[PDB]
Design a protein around this ligand. Sequence first.
Ligand code: W1M
Length: 165
Amino acid sequence: SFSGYLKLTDNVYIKNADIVEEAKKVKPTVVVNAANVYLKHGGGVAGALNKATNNAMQVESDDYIATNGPLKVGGSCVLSGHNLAKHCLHVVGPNVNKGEDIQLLKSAYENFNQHEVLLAPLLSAGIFGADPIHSLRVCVDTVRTNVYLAVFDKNLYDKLVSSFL
Ligand SMILES: Cn1ccc(C(=O)Nc2cccc(C(=O)O)c2)n1
């Protein structure tokens, strides 16, 4: 089960950890991927999760896209968790580096409410370009289910905890 997490609110928890390593240890029911609309798991959390599945997540995702077309920014899809989790909830947060509307971050987090417990990264943080402090605030104000946030970067983790209102 989840260990070493700091409780932020009644339902949001945070830990300075590699989400891939957290997933392999916990094997949660749901691991959230920081996905793009095309499910092209190239870099950041998506690239790391996909590489941990030996590219099985990408093969599965390409078949999903061939059948269904791309996701919407703010949307999600449930696919296999492979060796990491029972399921992977691929959530598309807005990518600020691609000029996408930051207001879609709340819609993206609403996808977590369909799952009772999730292991997740901060949406739109990292290479997506949004302020991680803002992402954590939208997370605690939007997600009502139990979310265990894994923040890879130690310095960012410390900044997030020390600035949490
Ligand atoms: C105001 N602003 C926008 C972006 C940032 C910012 O510090 N982003 C950032 C930088 C380094 C790592 C990570 C991460 O999620 O791993 C995120 N600050």
